[PDB]
């Protein structure tokens with residue numbers, strides 16, 4: 001009948017990239033339940049979104065009744081940790097086994113056979129991954145992933161796998177007029193980009209230098225800045241200027257975050273199913 | 278008859294509080310020569326003002342011919358280091374002896390007799406100071422200081438002495454509609470202020486806790502944040518979000534900075550002597 | 555909780571045995587019949603590439619059984635893989651909500667799961683396990699079958715340091731009220 | 738830089754001597770006379786509360802002199818205080834730009850200023866000093882606008898030794914080119 005605000009369950013929410021993308025698309029968000037452990041990430045989300053996010057702490061403490069009463073959910077998104085997918089413990093040991101939890105809760109949030117209401121879901125992981133692990137993930141999600149690289153809409157390499165049932169996940173990725181496509185577009189004043197794109201930025205500080213420092217300032221080599229990484233990933237400037245965090249902590253948060261333009265591309269079809277502004 | 282943009286020489290410029298105040302007042306700035314040696318402060322000024330600040334380096338390398346060439350100057354402002362004004366070396370040893378440099382350069386920038394063109398100057402120092410040092414400073418500047426506390430316009434105690442010939446330096450300080458007068462107005466979301474005003478914030482981190490931590494978040498004690506200190510001092514938020522600086526470096530920069538509303542109070546009469554937007 | 559069915563309406567049970575086989579072990583109680591080579595038990599081991607349509611073509615089913623490998627056999631696969639694949643194929647095998655009929659599942663563990671694995675299994679199977687001892691061997695069981703003594707945990711802990719369908723068939727007893735009793 | 742004045746037009750010089758007095762020392766060259774009520778020399782040691790109108794009330798001056806205390810004198814004041822106060826009172830004593838008259842200044846140091854103090858003094862006085870030595874040992878440094886070979890290690894070790902008074906003998910001859918500008922008493 002009438003479009004209603006979207007209700008979202010986000011697992012491994014990080015710095016609330018999903019809520020930010022949904023709000024920037026103009027979609028009304030009726031409820032955003034986020035499962036997240038890192039206190040700095042929760043602080044970022046809380047401050048930047050003014051308490052519109054209901055945080056529920058660890059994903060493994062979410063119960064079936066929790067999914068029943070917090071719900072119903074229109075969207076179920078998830079982004080498992082990728083530090084185990086050299087001491088890697090694979091999909092089944094360490095923190096890779098968290099993926100199944102997502103799967104678990106996903107089946108708890110699905111509507112029944114008689115319920116034909118709109119319900120969308122998405123799961124993100126890294127491409128660098130055992131082919132057997134990708135096989136098992138495709139098995140448990142009963143579908144195959146799309147591979148999207150942020151380089152077509154951002155100034156950095158970030159190839160990620162996305163499983164889900166969103167409309168047009170395989171449609172071609174085209175850049176927008178506002179997408180800062182080159183590193184120079186993401187730099188502060190008086191700073192020059194050595195390259196046009198930067199290699200995949202992880203949590204460690206060894207992924208900035210390309211290992212040649214990416215920036216030149218006053219003729220001296222220099223690494224990237226927090227606001228520069230924020231522009232690279234598509235976040236608003238000072239999005240992680242929270243909780244007295246230095247360059248290291250904000251880089252840790254942004255190095256595992258989602259590329260905002262990629263999530264925008266994936267969530268754009270949702271505007272034809274829920275209330276907008 | 279028609280005014281022109283103001284030309285400013287700022288000694289010990291810091292994070293360019295003077296330029297920020299002059300721009301916020303709407304005064305057209307034709308030249309802003311800043312002497313400053315801290316690379317973080319220079320970076321803050323450069324990025325936040327897009328290179329409009331001609332940065333010179335050590336104040337003691339400025340020559341008489343430098344004052345002649347970079348000049349003429351309409352405003353000469355200065356803010357000497359106050360770490361030597363327990364191991365204090367006074368006004369004549371350590372960094373306190375930098376004050377005279379200001380004095381020196383001030384008399385280089387003063388117009389000659391008969392050159393009745395408008396020329397204003399100002400020098401700031403801390404009240405905590407040997408009365409002999411205050412006496413000698415009043416001697417060298419040939420005038421007496423007005424004491425202004427930032428608590429009447431900001432949410433913090435900051436009593437400072439101001440020498441100068443600016444119009445109305447002794448007039449009463451009245452707050453504005455936008456002055457965040459209490460600590461609660463300066464905090465981020467989901468954070469509660471224990472007090473309404475905070476004690477004098479220095480560069481060290483032991484001046485935040487009042488030693489009771491000033492903020493409560495989620496029922497836990499917490500220190501102030503970088504954006505919170507920025508709001509306390511009257512700077513725009515993220516003004517020091519530069520150069521991968523953490524909480525410590527930004528607090529060091531803001532703890533010796535000027536109170537923006539105080540400098541606005543002192544610089545407001547300048548709108549009737551120079552061009553405005 | 556299911557109602558009990560009159561004895562004349564009881565049917566030959568269909569079972570899905572994952573990993574471990576209990577074919578003749580289940581005939582020993584009368585649920586299967588000897589002679590039917592196209593019988594009522596489907597046995598699979600490499601479930602890595604089995605899709606929901608595979609389970610649907612092998613069905614319908616009335617019991618889904620999964621078991622960890624025997625303790626002492628060095629596992630080529632991680633212990634949690636069995637639990638996760640059991641859960642997957644079980645959800646593949648559950649009847650649709652618009653056709654409620656007697657349906658049971660059971661996952662047994664031969665003390666191959668540690669504490670975190672036990673917690674994961676209890677979260678996914680929505681119940682705490684039940685231990686069965688032997689005076690020495692023991693098993694853990696999660697099941698929706700209504701079961702009919704007292705042992706502490708350190709016994710099992712030190713027994714695992716040392717280096718089994720006997721304890722399992724007793725759990726299959728309350729199923730007799732739902733299916734045929736051959737032999 | 739000034740032009741030399743004809744001898745019949747030369748005047749009795751007026752000097753401002755701070756910290757160290759050269760009154761009886763400057764009479765020896767003829768710039769002062771014994772029978773003078775004002776004395777033409779104004780001497781003052783504690784200049785902490787000296788205002789500009791004080792220097793102005795003390796009559797116009799033609800020479801301003803300041804000196805550091807002798808080396809064998811424990812400084813109660815920091816060594817740079819003398820330099821800064823000399824600069825202040827000198828700027829107080831300069832004639833207005835609308836009256837270009839002969840005017841000279843002189844600051845002398847008895848090796849009480851270290852290297853950073855030397856650089857500060859050379860920055861404020863807009864010139865490098867000149868060293869006057871004493872053979873058989875003392876020495877002085879001089880900054881002055883009067884148009885009047887030893888390495889530094891000698892002075893360094895000499896200053897370290899000479900701790901355990903003020904030599905006007907070395908500064909006296911610097912006042913000689915001032916004779917072409919003021920009266921020369923018998």
Ligand SMILES: Nc1ncnc2c1ncn2[C@@H]1O[C@H](CSCC[C@H](N)C(=O)O)[C@@H](O)[C@H]1O
Pocket residue numbers: 011012013014015016017035036037038041057058059060078079080081095098256257258259
């Ligand atoms: N057991 C757990 N329960 C809930 N969240 C967890 C978790 N283990 C890790 N996480 C969180 O999951 C995040 C995965 S990084 C991905 C963040 C998010 N997809 C984004 O785009 O920003 C990490 O930041 C971590 O804090």
Ligand SMILES: Nc1ncnc2c1ncn2[C@@H]1O[C@H](CSCC[C@H](N)C(=O)O)[C@@H](O)[C@H]1O
Pocket residue numbers: 288289290291292293294312313314315318334335336337355356357358372375533534535536
């Ligand atoms: N010798 C020197 N030459 C130039 N700048 C100096 C200096 N010694 C110290 N400074 C700078 O002077 C600053 C004084 S703190 C005052 C900063 C400024 N008044 C403000 O309101 O922001 C310090 O940040 C220091 O970096």
